[PDB]
Design a binder for this molecule. Structure first.
Ligand code: HEM
Ligand code: HEM
Lengths: 426, 426
């Protein structure tokens, strides 16, 4: 099975038997992606065990895969297991089942239902300053992913349901997945065992805690299929939110000529520390020119993936069935051929002046097509609503223990090695 | 493989393919054991999947298996998995490894180290009355396995380490094992996955909480092998203790002519509510004649098991290798041929007058032989030390919701269906 890329004339790193190419993950997904983009060119192939992965960099191919032929050939993501009752969640569902669930869950992030969420988010952005004013008034670094996490936690529990808890009460919230890929034929076994990658007690904790996004559901849909959708929203709305807030907070304290220039637009549209509304936010381009630049540097999903469900010949290339087409986000976001000095944080790539020479099938940090980030709008609203309410009250400087430059986690997920700490000044 | 008991001329219930006889577990281990003792006689056989189990009732065979030929042919228990680092714990260890660990852990339950534990147990037997005086002074049933559990928890955390917590702070503390037996060939897989029957977070909770019985350890032994031994002691010292306390408490409120007659010996050896010492306890025969009668009725382990590691011919019968010899405790404890009116709770079977006509290879509620209950003494001390400190202060009467007669759990473990509740009067 490992001669599929020798056959189709597609170059690649040679795969070891049984293991495939995962031996080269020893530095991380991202570094293995940038590596081969230099090694073999515009299209290369590798194997995740016996699993052949096609890496595409041509932005038309990318468009064909995510948008044009999404509904036809590349509908679903890579098989990930074992999960259990979670097989119904949207980021996991496939074919016809996903269609019924992406329709049903689209109503949540409209321009009308998101504006309904700015005044309720205006409540926890003040539990964020008051919990960041206690660790500022005293000389002491600050662990951004706790206070932002405590924040991002509070936001998601309400933007969808309605529960309210100051995450200082500490409400709730790659060791073995390594074997998934060399033993994907073992996933069918683990299922008939109820066994979960999500420990069966984080789920039983919520196999009853479920029994607004909650409203707009029961308002056709099932009930064990109702539990799962709350889960994903809770993870993404917490983890992804806090993670990037601290990611930008690092690039603001280590680039203070940008931290002040962003603080000089915040006191222009919102004078006298004016609370942010749905519309004042969308005005601010630098806050966008930054958020889009950090996400151009730290794409929190690194790669997009789709599963080629039949023989196709997109943009000149015969693609066989069962292959995983993989858009290597992190590697493009930092490609020289498309970004000058790409290691450098320069929110002026997303200036209206320059955001013309910017191809949205290279910078896709929320994906694209009918299966793109369904929370992208809610995400880009939830972040800047906290980015404003914090760059009005505090300016951030390096610490003594602040990881400069920031070491990305060479393991799996995209996070820093040591957590981002920063000195906060009022 | 399922023709092993047709071969050896041993009668039994006919086994379905692949499943074996576990279909007959639909009423519980115990009822399936009593059933076949009537069906086929003194020796019968059945299959736990492909796993042949030999049930022996002859008390000499039983003696040959537990005591005489224990070190030789029947050393270890049934293979139970998957476990992980827990493969070193004593109740699990086998062959040579178990010898090094039953020696090392014998010093804990001497007459000298147990007497050192009566004054420290005299401390939580008073947190038991004061937590049972709050639910008595007010008219309200009492859930015995909480207050006893809260008690039995407190005792074991100190009798071995030294930590002290009133278990009212709520400190810490058959869905899928059904597949173990039909798929025992899947246990080798699950191991290379770190996967635990004990959820990997109840263990990570203590993969660091470990880093007296604690003293007598590091005083040769390992450290990941030190964590496991604390675990078993914590379960057995908590669960088994509370469970039987409530088991006797049921048989004392539903047999009050015994509850008073035991309260009439307690105020004889310990006058003026005298605190119990190591020696006053051993004096009291009825408190023993009861504890031994409840355990004759509710044997908390139901069956003893050993694994026949080579061809043998004990007491006339050729026994092949790899068979699990199983002493059906629950079925003997309630055998007519050895106990008149065996359903009836009558602590006078264990009177010194009658405890002569009583064969200790039939009543073995702590087993026997070199692999018997290592905590039996500590157990029979920990229980009566709470049985005294409670039958001095309170008398127990039926409630309106008290399960009379007591329905045993027809699932797996030996517990009641509804928890035992009782009205407590001071
Ligand atoms: C900075 C924050 C976020 C980023 C960078 C991000 C990025 C992404 C990406 C790259 C994808 C995959 C798209 C593809 O492969 O085609 C995705 C999918 C998804 N995201 Fe997010 N996301 C963010 C926040 C959120 C939030 C707050 C939610 C709240 C529910 C969310 C829910 C989802 C869902 C449901 C999907 C899958 C949609 C589907 O498969 O139909 N994301 N996101
Ligand atoms: C009423 C209370 C208890 C009862 C009825 C009981 C009963 C038993 C039984 C029937 C066995 C199996 C013997 C065999 O199959 O040969 C056993 C083994 C064992 N019990 Fe208990 N037990 C009790 C309390 C305890 C306590 C408090 C501990 C504390 C550590 C404990 C620790 C153990 C250990 C370590 C073994 C296995 C010894 C070995 O395999 O070497 N038990 N017990």
């Amino acid at each position: 099975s490992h001669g599929l890329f020798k056959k189709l004339g597609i170059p690649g790193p040679t795969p070891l038997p049984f293991l495939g190419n995962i031996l080269s993950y020893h530095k991380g997904f991202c570094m293995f992606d940038m590596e081969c983009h230099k090694k073999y060119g515009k299209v290369w192939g590798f194997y995740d065990g016996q699993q052949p992965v096609l890496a595409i960099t041509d932005p038309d191919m990318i468009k064909t895969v995510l948008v044009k032929e999404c509904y036809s050939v590349f509908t679903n993501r890579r098989p990930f297991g074992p999960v259990g009752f979670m097989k119904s969640a949207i980021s996991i569902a496939e074919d016809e089942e996903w269609k019924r669930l992406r329709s049903l869950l689209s109503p949540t992030f409209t321009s009308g239902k998101l504006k309904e969420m700015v005044p309720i988010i205006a409540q926890y952005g003040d539990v964020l300053v008051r919990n960041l004013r206690r660790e500022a008034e005293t000389g002491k670094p600050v662990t951004l992913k706790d206070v932002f996490g405590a924040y991002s936690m509070d936001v998601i529990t309400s933007t969808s349901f309605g529960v309210n808890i100051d995450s200082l009460n500490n409400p709730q919230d790659d060791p073995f997945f390594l074997s998934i890929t060399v033993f994907p034929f073992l996933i069918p076994i683990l299922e008939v065992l109820n066994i979960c990658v999500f420990p069966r007690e984080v789920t039983n904790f919520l196999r009853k805690s479920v029994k607004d996004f909650l409203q707009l559901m029961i308002d056709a849909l099932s009930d064990l299929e109702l539990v799962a959708q709350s889960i994903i929203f809770i993870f993404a709305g917490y983890e992804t939110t806090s993670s990037v807030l601290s990611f930008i907070m690092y690039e603001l304290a280590t680039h203070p000529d940008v931290q002040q220039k962003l603080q000089e637009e915040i006191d222009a549209v919102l004078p006298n520390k004016a609370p942010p509304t749905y519309d004042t936010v969308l005005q601010m381009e630098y806050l966008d020119m930054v958020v889009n630049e950090t996400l151009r540097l730290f794409p929190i999903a690194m790669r997009l993936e789709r599963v080629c469900k039949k023989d196709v010949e997109i943009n000149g290339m015969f693609i066989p069935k069962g292959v995983v087409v993989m858009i290597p986000s992190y590697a493009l976001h930092r490609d020289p051929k498309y970004w000058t000095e790409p290691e450098k944080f320069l929110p002026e790539r997303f200036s209206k002046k320059n955001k013309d020479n910017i191809d949205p099938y290279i910078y896709t940090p929320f994906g694209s097509g009918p299966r793109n980030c369904i929370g992208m709008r809610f995400a880009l609203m939830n972040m800047k609503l906290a980015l404003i309410r914090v760059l009005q009250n505090f300016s951030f400087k390096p610490c003594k223990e602040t990881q400069i430059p920031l070491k990305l986690s060479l393991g799996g997920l995209l996070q820093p090695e040591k957590p981002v700490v920063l000195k906060v000044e009022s």
